[PDB]
Ligand binder design. Structure first.
Ligand SMILES: O=c1cc(-c2ccc(O)c(O)c2)oc2cc(O)cc(O)c12
Ligand SMILES: O=c1cc(-c2ccc(O)c(O)c2)oc2cc(O)cc(O)c12
Lengths: 113, 116, 116, 113
């Protein structure tokens, strides 16, 4: 699991469950092509998005559908989504973590091994 | 002004100065159009991006060039940029302050929305 | 003023108004002494806590009464308060802005330190 | 493991390793008595601080020695430490997470089950 996503809910102090996540890779023509996607689990994690062979150096975007999550809870949100854009470079494992509030979010990368 | 951007450096505990900011607005055909741009001042603030009549309802994107900032300081950061996407003025005009707090492998963004 | 406190509400995307703030200074005998206090204004800011001559070197604690704020809004928050502890003016006088960003089960605090 | 602590480093995008953590419980005389302590592991986690029998309702403080961590890395820090104070109330498990920068930190509680 070279790439993992973890989402937390700052309002309820819990994992953010069933949040849609989309991963894109930047293409030569500079547009974003879909690469992988999923929903966070009960623990607010999304595993299995990709593999070591597949996850080559490049620029990647992770898009988290924050707005649907807040809508689900009946709380007005500010952001359309939360977007994280990064260069992967060459034995690393990437965890993209996000902490969510209706009017704020924080994202962090934990890069290890 | 109805849109202001404020950037802070969590490493040095200072305003993040001379940070490029680009604003886009989603067009009818679903493309992003250039709306405004500028750089943060000595205070880490960017004022004067737009006006009340220009800043109509829509979906707006604020892209903060975090990578260039960190690189200029000798640091190779994780993120390409910090992007904030939002619907504006849906319920009538408001004043928006977009704040970003920057670290090399993390950032937080917050909106303060007030009623003119 | 050399010490200012700014509080924001991450839920409502607004300044956190009428938030009690208490400041203490570590005494010679290692006890915390009352230094100053106040409440955040409509802008979420608290000014006028102290003066340049009063605000000498030392270790300072700023306790923000987050619990009362959330409770007044109907929310039972995780934290009792948000506490910020820091050495001040160790290298000569500085201006300190202590910022807090509040959510019911989370908070962030940041210091902006500038040279008068 | 009713109580767990997780610390991350926002500068290096990594777990915050070997960070000292102290847990206190508020006593009737209103002072803090030491309850438990440890250092974060390689994964930036501290487990085994307490047990279900032991971890009764009360007000607890978790103190993270952020300043020593930054000193270890040669980076000037603002805070003396990061303090998290909370009421535990009654089948919960508590994870206290902290994200560290030299001039800023964020803490979040993930409370589950
Ligand atoms: O100093 C300011 C600091 C912040 C701020 C504080 C914490 C954050 O985690 C964040 O993402 C932004 O937000 C502000 C928002 C303001 O309207 C004015 C300010 O001076 C600040
Ligand atoms: O990677 C983790 C990252 C975070 C986290 C992420 C962002 C924050 O602003 C914060 O304050 C904590 O919280 C976690 C919380 C967990 O329970 C497990 C984890 O692995 C993480």
């Amino acid at each position: 699991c070279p790439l993992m996503v973890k989402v937390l809910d700052a309002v309820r102090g819990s994992p953010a469950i069933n949040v849609a996540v989309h991963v894109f890779r930047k293409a030569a023509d500079d547009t974003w092509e879909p690469f992988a996607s999923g929903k966070t689990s009960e623990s607010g994690e999304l595993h299995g998005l990709t593999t070591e062979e597949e996850f080559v150096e490049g620029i990647y975007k992770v898009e988290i559908d924050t707005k649907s999550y807040w809508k689900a809870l009946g709380i007005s949100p500010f952001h359309e989504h939360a977007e994280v854009v990064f260069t992967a470079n060459d034995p690393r494992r990437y965890t993209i973590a996000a902490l969510l509030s209706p009017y704020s979010y924080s994202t962090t990368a934990v890069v290890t091994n």
